[PDB]
RNA sequence: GAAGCCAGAGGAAACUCUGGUGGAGGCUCGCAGCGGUUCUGACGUGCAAAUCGAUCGUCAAAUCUGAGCAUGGGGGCGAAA
RNA sequence: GGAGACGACGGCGGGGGCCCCGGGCAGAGUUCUCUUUUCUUCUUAACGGUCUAUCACCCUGGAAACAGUUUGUCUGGAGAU
RNA sequence: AGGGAAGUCGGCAAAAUAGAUCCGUAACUUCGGGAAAAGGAUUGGCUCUAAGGGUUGGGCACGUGCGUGCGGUUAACAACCAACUUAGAACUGGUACGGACAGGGGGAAUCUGACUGUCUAAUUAAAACAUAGCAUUGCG
RNA sequence: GGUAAACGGCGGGAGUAACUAUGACUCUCUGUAGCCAAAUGGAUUAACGAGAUUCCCACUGUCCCUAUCUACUAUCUAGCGAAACCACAGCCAAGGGAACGGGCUUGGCAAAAUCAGCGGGGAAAGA
RNA sequence: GAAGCAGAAUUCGGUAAGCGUUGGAUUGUUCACCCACUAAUAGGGAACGUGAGCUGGGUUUAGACCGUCGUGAGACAGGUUAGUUUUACCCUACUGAUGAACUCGUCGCAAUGGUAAUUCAGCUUAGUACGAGAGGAACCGCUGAUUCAGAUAAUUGGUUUUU
RNA sequence: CGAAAGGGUCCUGUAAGCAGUAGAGUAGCCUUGUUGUUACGAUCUGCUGAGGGUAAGCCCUCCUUCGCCUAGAUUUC
């Protein structure tokens, strides 16, 4: 279940987007910027156990290995395999392009 | 932080409750649960 | 998940540890029942000379309850207000 | 001398009834498509006869290399298997 | 919407939590508890896999379906029958997966009464009363 | 005479000449975690609580700051149909010695008959 | 209006109530003082010369505990806890809504009553006047914002029995 | 004027049904595997921005249809 599903769509309850997840997977600098926007001592497991695919911190290595068997992690894997939706795909959907000369 | 993780004084997301642990430590210090005294000046 | 019991590993023995079994308690969550905590509650010539809603306490017993019978005002009865 | 004649609680086993599943006769419904389909009746009293059913008891025999045995460790030279 | 107790005497009210599987669980303690402490991971459908059962049934030599005297523990095998749990895996929809219903908010402390219990029917349910324990007095 | 020594009184400790109660008369009094006790040195007492209190996280219309939707009313109609209360009545201002005016004096003013609301006043609390 | 008032910022005083005068913390307490924002966070009356709007303290029926006093019933120097008043449909006032008589209707007038806006900032003037220096204005002109008031739903949010 | 209809404009999100060398796997019949085959099977793909709704306080329609009409009663210097 979802904790406090009534206010799930509030901006203060927002979660990291899938295109950001792909960019974190592709380049470690973008992931490092996202991690520098956080505080290490206030994270589960002091930030040592992180799932990039779910964009989620975990209290222990066995907890990370545990959620990997779950279906939300597999949903994130299949969504990343399909590919997230970007502005390039948005322009290709309407047949629009960029002319740089 | 170590005392909070040892005693389970955790917030949402495993964050240690240093506020509550500090209040507990201060109360223990006042209420005769931690040994402390001021030594008398030597003559 | 108390005694009692079985098996294994030890221990000179008494005992120790581990895995089960077992099903105790004026123990506990909670349905009915019994009760009556709270709400700027409803109602206030009310459905009602004490009712209604939600919430709450208890729920294997110092639990709930019928009929028969006993105690009668200078009295009775009273876990005593 | 027995019966009348006796608490509360826990799990276990037997029986009746109810619930559930399958086949068959008959009836009813559904049927654009599907569904050899869905549903309904198919019962047997008191009173008796007969054959049987845990506990327990009797006979033979005498058990350690102890045995029988319950979900629950009780039984046995005071005679077990 | 945004903020999140700035409201109010006072978080009153509402919201949030809630079933189940798994990981994990501090101080204190009368060692029994605290404890569902705290803090985390997951839950739909479909197609499969695996595990957990019951009944029946042994070869000769004689007498004649049983009686013996033997011989054997691979029945570790066949035939028939049957129900519900548990674990594992792939595939697949998704904003929701205890999808309605149902259903603990949690924590740090202090005062207070040991606890379970009882009373002012119709304004007070409580530190009041009772309770087990303890102490005293009287009576052969 | 002895005490449940219960209530109560009760600053001690020495002496003496009193000699028993009451004495009386002088004197003077200020270990940064140990030792000792049958592990512990406790009431800073666990569990339990519709008991009272402070705070933290979460949470939210408590608030900024209100808006919107539903049902039942209120509303209008048909039928049915009370009660409370009621000296008489009801617009104000200033004065009306007894710190009170609704009625008097002097002014402002002032136009039929009505409906929905409201809680200033009058009425309204088994007041 | 006055002041060594250079400028800037002020101080003392006068006319003036038109228009504003805030948000919070703190109850081991006469809840009054702190904090910030701001142009500023002025003071009072209409109650307190007794007095039915709501709701907390003085505050106090009946239950209960502690302290002081009392032989006691109980009382208090006191401290704490929990605890029953529940209209409106009447008259008036107020806010809105109809309306008889003047044939019906259209277009008007305006007695009288009400009346509304407010404050700050920025650009320019200008780094100018003034000034040893540090610093540092104003009139006219231009643009926004604060508080108030009256509307409106193109857009953006919210609301969904469009069931 | 009214009731339908048509077109538009909006709302949702791709109908029912059929088919498919899509589909994890399972089970039969035989060529015993060579999409072997047939059967079932969440879902997927196509027909299909399709289906459904649309004023109830949306718009247009002499020229898309069907009805309705010069009343009745009461009052009036």
Contact status, residue B36 vs residue B29, Cβ threshold 8 Å: yes
Burial class (CB in 10 A: 0-12, 13-18, 19+), B37: exposed
Residues 6 or more apart from B38 whose CB is under 8 A from it?
Answer: none
Contact status, residue A93 vs residue A78, Cβ threshold 8 Å: no
Q: What is the DSSP string of A25-80?
A: HH-HHHHHHHHHTS-GGGSGGGGTSEETTTTEE-S-HHHHHHHHTSHHHHHHHHHH
Contact status, residue A80 vs residue A22, Cβ threshold 8 Å: yes
Shortest CA distance to A44 belongs to which of A60, A32, A29?
A: A60
Nearest 5°: CA angle at A73, between A71 and A78? 90
What is the bridge-based pairing of β-strands A50-51 and A56-57? antiparallel
| Chain-chain contact of B13 with A41 (C-beta, under 8 angstroms) | no
Task: Scan for tokens 């222990």, then name that residue.
Answer: A60
* Chain A positions in Cβ-Cβ contact with residue B13 (cut-off 8 Å): 42-44, 57
Please indicate the experimental technique that yielded this structure: cryo-EM
Contact status, residue A67 vs residue A58, Cβ threshold 8 Å: yes
Token reading at B35? 């040994």
* CB contact A41 to B (< 8 Å): yes
Which residues on neighbouring strands pair with residue A57, listed in sequence order?
A: A50
* CB contact A42 to B (< 8 Å): yes
């Amino acid at each position: 279940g979802v904790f406090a599903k009534r206010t799930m769509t509030k901006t203060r309850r927002r979660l990291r987007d899938l295109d950001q997840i792909e960019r974190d997977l592709r380049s470690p600098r973008h992931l490092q910027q996202y991690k520098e926007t956080k505080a290490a001592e206030d994270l589960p497991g002091l930030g040592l156990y992180y799932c990039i695919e779910c964009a989620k911190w975990f209290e222990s290595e066995t907890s990370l290995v545990g959620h990997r068997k779950g279906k939300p992690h597999k949903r994130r894997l299949k969504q990343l395999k399909e590919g997230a939706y970007t502005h390039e795909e948005a322009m290709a959907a309407i047949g629009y392009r960029i002319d740089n000369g | 932080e170590m005392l909070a993780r040892k005693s389970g004084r955790l917030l949402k997301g495993g964050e240690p409750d240093v506020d509550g642990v500090a209040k507990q430590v201060l109360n223990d210090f006042m209420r005769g649960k931690i040994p402390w005294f001021t030594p008398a000046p030597e003559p």
